[PDB]
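Fig. S4 source data, part A: sequence.
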Amino acid sequence: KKDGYPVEYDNCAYICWNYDNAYCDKLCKDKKADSGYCYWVHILCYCYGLPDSEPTKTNGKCK
């Protein structure tokens, strides 16, 4: 398991709906994580307990 910002190709994270924590929680759980929230500093969804196989953000900008 891992915690992090889930991404789509390539290295592009999921922006929150507004600043909605519930949105990110649902998104994260649909990706099989334990939970998630909207990190307001970046306005991105952050997940707790993603599967090891789910891609997460690394050092790098969105393609």
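Fig. S4 source data, part B ends here. The chain is about 15% helix and 30% strand.
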